[PDB]
Amino acid sequence: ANSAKLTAYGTLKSALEKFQTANTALNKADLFKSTVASSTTEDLKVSTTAGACAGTYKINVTQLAAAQSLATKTTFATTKEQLGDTSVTSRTIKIEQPGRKEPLEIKLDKGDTSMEAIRDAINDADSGICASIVKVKENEFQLVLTANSGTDNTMKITVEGDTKLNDLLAYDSTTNTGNMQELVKAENAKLNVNGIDIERQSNTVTDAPQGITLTLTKKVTDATVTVTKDDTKAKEAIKSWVDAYNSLVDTFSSLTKYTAVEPGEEASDKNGALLGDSVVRTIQTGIRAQFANSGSNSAFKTMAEIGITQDGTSGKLKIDDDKLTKVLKDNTAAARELLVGDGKETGITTKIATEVKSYLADDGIIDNAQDNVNA
């Protein structure tokens, strides 16, 4: 007798957890301000997440971003040949960049003055400089050191403790003098969006309109980027939450299912163990009150106006898909305020999340019911 009650309690808890997970998935409001963008050219790339003013942008990519890469002035026999003094036990390589707070220091050992060793140490630094070796032809090799993109990453190199390695790797970017040689010079990205000039370090421009991120593969002219509203994710989330509510109420009805029996007959095992439970009735009444919104500033106060209606017998909400789509498309802000609102007290999603959290909160009605049952 009590085992069936405990099993019903566990099933109800599992269903409530699933419904809470679905509602939490619905909670985030970035889906309502969802846009989709496209461009005429295949060079420019566009990505929009939220907060994008739907419209048309004439995006001109007047420039791309180049890193800085430097190379030695001397070719060598191979990689393993020594490029510095072997009598010196240790030495330091110092690289100064305007965009870093403190200079970069690399410690080099006694016999590790081979281009392979220098390259491995510098690539192990992992602070915006990367090393490579260039094989021009047979019996020729060069060392190449590269920065990241932007004029804030031009670099000035010096060596302390050694003199030959300082005769090799010393470069001064501020004075444009050094023992290395410049391969690739650093530049900034520059574009024009709807009459506003935008400058960036890299080629991933993110706040020309705040909310739209561009990618500059090639220089383009008068490329049209069109951004439109979108709610397919919004409607999919709405239907997912509706189906989760349907599953939850179906589980509640099954746990509260009662089968008519003849007088004097034995109790059927098909009967739900949650018949006449105060917690179930309280939770269902709270959710039903959540259905008819109060305190919202939206024009539509209920999804009955939106088009979602709950059948009494089945307990499953049925969606008027076309009318819901019309409501979402015509007035986005009204639906968003109805479901989200300020996010603290108003908004159907917000209030339902708060109510379900309170129901599942510690020392709540569920915890008290469990304590009473286990007592």
Next chain:
Amino acid sequence: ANSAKLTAYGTLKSALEKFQTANTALNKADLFKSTVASSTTEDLKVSTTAGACAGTYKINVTQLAAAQSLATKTTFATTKEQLGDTSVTSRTIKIEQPGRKEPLEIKLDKGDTSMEAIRDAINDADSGICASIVKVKENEFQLVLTANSGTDNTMKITVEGDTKLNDLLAYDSTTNTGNMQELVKAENAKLNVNGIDIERQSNTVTDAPQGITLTLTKKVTDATVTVTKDDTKAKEAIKSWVDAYNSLVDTFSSLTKYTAVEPGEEASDKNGALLGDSVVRTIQTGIRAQFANSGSNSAFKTMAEIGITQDGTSGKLKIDDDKLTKVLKDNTAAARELLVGDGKETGITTKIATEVKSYLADDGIIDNAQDNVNA
């Protein structure tokens, strides 16, 4: 004995409901005036639903539609900095557009003069103006307000209650004066179709020929849009309705199936419980008479001329696909009048829909039979 009769009644009701659903799906008549269109270029897009004169249109997209977007004249330190007086408790922002009946008013609070707050309020208005923030570079920000497409949506902005915010957001489009600056100027879409000039607000042109909707991604010249008649949807609907009628008559024959038995033997359960019933015979006779169309203006006076013939033993219709396709292709209006007609009195589909609805209507022969049986 009576339980079998009730089961047969329920099965007949379900079969008739399915047939009525299929017939109602068939009832929609725009499928006969179905066309399909295509263009030479991939810039112009075309969509045709109904009422399109099949032919060739030389469509020149001489212009596209631009919205209006405005921006402030001052750059600021960040978003959260205040842009208006803090001693003022509340204020009003008024936007006047020719295409709206009443002006747009936005209420701004005391400490909410930050570009984020203004942007959120204006995007919450949801009346054809959208707000965004532009990050030119580090320690630079702009506010951008955008309209919709068309010269009917140019806007004039003023502020009541505050003076700094009025020194910021006030624009006058009629006089081309203001405190903001124009980024994108509004224009109308203009195209030429078969020698007729068409002007629109947006870039979705819908009534150049009434029934064909164009989409203007790029300016195109002498693009050929060819529109041809189509009946694949029509023939698919015809086959679907015929197969639904086949299923209906198969269910009827099963419910009226009589198996030969030796005299004096018990009643077989395989025998349909609907044997010798007036309702079934009356409905079948009515449908059969509906097949023999009367009063239609079409040249073909019967659906048998089309090519679909009903087998006597099975009762399920078989379609001569080639002859039906020939009839549909050669004379579309004749077939449409034969099946649809004026939509009130004549037409095979219209007569059949009316008859089946009357059979399934409340207080009809089926409801009377149910009342008699349940009594």
Next chain:
Amino acid sequence: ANSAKLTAYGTLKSALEKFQTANTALNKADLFKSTVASSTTEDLKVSTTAGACAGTYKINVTQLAAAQSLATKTTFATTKEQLGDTSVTSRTIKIEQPGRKEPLEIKLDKGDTSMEAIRDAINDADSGICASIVKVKENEFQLVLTANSGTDNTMKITVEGDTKLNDLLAYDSTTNTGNMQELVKAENAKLNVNGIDIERQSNTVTDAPQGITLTLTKKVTDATVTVTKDDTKAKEAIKSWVDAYNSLVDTFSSLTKYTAVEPGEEASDKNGALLGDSVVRTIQTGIRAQFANSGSNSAFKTMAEIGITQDGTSGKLKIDDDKLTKVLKDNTAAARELLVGDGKETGITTKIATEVKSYLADDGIIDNAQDNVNA
């Protein structure tokens, strides 16, 4: 005992029906003269069915076909506004075309002088004229009437019974005068194929070489259309006929299968009930004799030369696919005459079809056997 005989007779009848159906599918000889075509450009489209001289055609599409479409000289307030006298009870619209035997007459009612009503009536005519409405802008509407393609479809319009509608819709194409206005003027399609000029009405040219149908989407110059022989359909049909014969012979062998048993044992049910039957032996002997052709003018007299040989024990044909492909590719007309010939007495497919039909014909040996068994 006799039940097994009847079952075997029915199985043989079904197998013979299937073989006859497959042979009838094989009978048609258009597959032997099968070609496949292609073009260099994607504007021109090509379709070849039969009787096409394989080769190369330099096809120049010097012109396309334009229909004729006319429009009114006056714009109106809307569709529902009346266009003619309301006191007149009925009136007639007459359209004369050179390509039609009798003029087109449309009857218009008393209060049905709205552009919607005229448009619906003319589209209901369904005689090569279609009606549409054009919305230039707000509070502007036009009526447009369109013909089909070709100079044989230019039309002359008049109205009898009414004077205002005659002031609206009257056009004279012969004199180029009227109350309507010309939008699209009619032209003929003109192309050049292998030095021969071809003229057509529409843009579907079908007899430049008799057997090849072109489609003219855009004007093209020196497009090369290459047409080659093809027998993949012929090969697949040959395989299908061979497999059908294999199935038929397997069914015959099963119905004539005899299982060795010890003397004095009972008759096995595995034994075919068609053992020692005159009709079955006669049919099999006829098929075996017609396997090798007599009276054919082809160099090869049997498919044993071609490569298809019947196994002794199983009786199912096995195909030497490589040798059959070689025979088909090297000599097409020889194999065609060998299978088809004149189509009356010679040709293996034709005379086999005749023999099988005579076997299955009414009052034939099969029907006589059925009558004798049922007697």
Next chain:
Amino acid sequence: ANSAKLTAYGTLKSALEKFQTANTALNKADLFKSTVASSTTEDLKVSTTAGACAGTYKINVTQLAAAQSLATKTTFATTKEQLGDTSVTSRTIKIEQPGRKEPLEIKLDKGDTSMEAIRDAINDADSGICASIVKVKENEFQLVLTANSGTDNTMKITVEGDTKLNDLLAYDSTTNTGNMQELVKAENAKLNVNGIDIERQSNTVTDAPQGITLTLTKKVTDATVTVTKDDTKAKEAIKSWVDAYNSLVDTFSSLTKYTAVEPGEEASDKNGALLGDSVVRTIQTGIRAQFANSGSNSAFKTMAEIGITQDGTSGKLKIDDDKLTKVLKDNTAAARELLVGDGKETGITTKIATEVKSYLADDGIIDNAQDNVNA
């Protein structure tokens, strides 16, 4: 007892037949000289089978091949109209071509002087001339006769027995005089491959390098066709043969499988019936001797050097795929000689095929064993 022995003999024979089939599939050596080609342009097409010198060919398609097609000088009313004398019972049409050994003769009947009849007869000739009918417009028709590609197929036509048909179809290509008229003039294909000029009749060039076949869809300039070595087919065949040998030895071990039993116990039915058989041991010893190649001129004497090693317990070969690929890629000729060689006495595949055919041939060890068993 003997039934199990016969079943084991049959299973061994089936396994040996399958292994022999796999070895015969492996036998052909064209897989070792396998190349793959590609081109820069999509006009030129390339196909390589064997014997192709891997490298780069600059192929210039300076010309394509045109057939010859002729047409009559008179247009007619239709096809069924007679084009020749009806009093003449029969007549001859003679076509002479330089590329044919004997002239082409067509016999025409009394009333068969219709363009349809002439066309059908000439298409029935099937000797490089094909007939077609051209419908210029209404009440106009032409007859067109076409050759194949190459200047060796220009044709000269005359008629014996009739005068009108000779006034119609007589053409002289040598003197460029006739009653027909030329539509398409015959030309030869000309291309340049790696500085060598190649001339052909058709547009399928096959021996510019002997082993590479080109296809000339359009005139191309400086198209680079690169041909590289390939062994994916070779390695796949090697794996297939190795797995076939694995299956064969697995079957042998199953038929020679022995299970240990306790003293005094009954013989296990899981034991193979081929335990201690002279034929099996002899065949396996011969195969293992073939594994250790002798007389080969290759640097490698065994696939153990290549990477394929035979496990003792399972008896199935295990392949070092990486090492086998290395061996195949580095030295193709060495592996080819090791497996194939001259194809008569040396080569592992050759010797294995000879040994297996000798084992499975009539009067062989298996046939002798079966004869002894039947004795």
Next chain:
Amino acid sequence: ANSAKLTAYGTLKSALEKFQTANTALNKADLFKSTVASSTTEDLKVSTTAGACAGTYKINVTQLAAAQSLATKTTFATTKEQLGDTSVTSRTIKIEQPGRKEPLEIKLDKGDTSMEAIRDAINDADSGICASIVKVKENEFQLVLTANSGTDNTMKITVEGDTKLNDLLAYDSTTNTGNMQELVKAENAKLNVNGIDIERQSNTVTDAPQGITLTLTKKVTDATVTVTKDDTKAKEAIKSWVDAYNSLVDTFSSLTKYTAVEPGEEASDKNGALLGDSVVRTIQTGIRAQFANSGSNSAFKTMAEIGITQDGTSGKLKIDDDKLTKVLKDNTAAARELLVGDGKETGITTKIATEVKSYLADDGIIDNAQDNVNA
């Protein structure tokens, strides 16, 4: 009882072998230095394996590589005709190349002076020269000999023992004199990458930056090749190793599973036979200490900081995928040192590989346990 213990030992050994295989698969460290490259043009092809400096390279393909191919000066009747003296029993063909250590010698027999025989012998030599036959037209043939790509493979040919074959095949590349003729002249590949000129023999350039391999299909200008860091392989390997450890711990817990039973009851079969085993506890403690690694120079001293945490009850690791991705993306060298390090003494993967190898090493704790059990 002991059979269950042996089965548990075998299961533990199999699970540990699988975990060792997975950890050895993870042991390879070049996955951490994984990059992905792309180009703007479709001609140039790019591949990257490891050690690639992420950035942008402007690659100009100023030249491609051509092999050398030579041909005879005389055309012949066919292939089988003899091209040399028949009285000479044997002769030698000598080819000298700068890029080979010793000259190439081909031995030719008495009657084997046919172009087919010479071609087959030279293609059988397989030392960078390949032979082909060219059919210019009917009754014309040429022999063509081709080298490989690069000026180091120009070849000089002479014949010893014969005078006619030496009159045919003798070429001198150094002096540009000979009896053959040059078809294709040899050249070197030349490109420019980020201001560094690169020269190669073939068209597969591999060390312009050491780590990026280019393929030069066509001459390209200012092609941008962008190379970015990548860790999808890294994260997939990490997750695969984590799941392998999870499965290993699940197997361990199954072999150490203990089920609570009533006192005096029989031992459950579900209880693992490895309960209270020193080897299992030692291995698990060692591996758990390996996660809590010491001596690593990485900023994160524990893998738990990355985001992968082991549940006590289940023993299977749960991965914080987002935090793992952030850790890998932000600091690649730190994670690499944490897992790999120098590869000898530090690095979690290195420590775990050493520990598991020692556990599974011969004469180890597992081998000693097996020896004790089998004793």
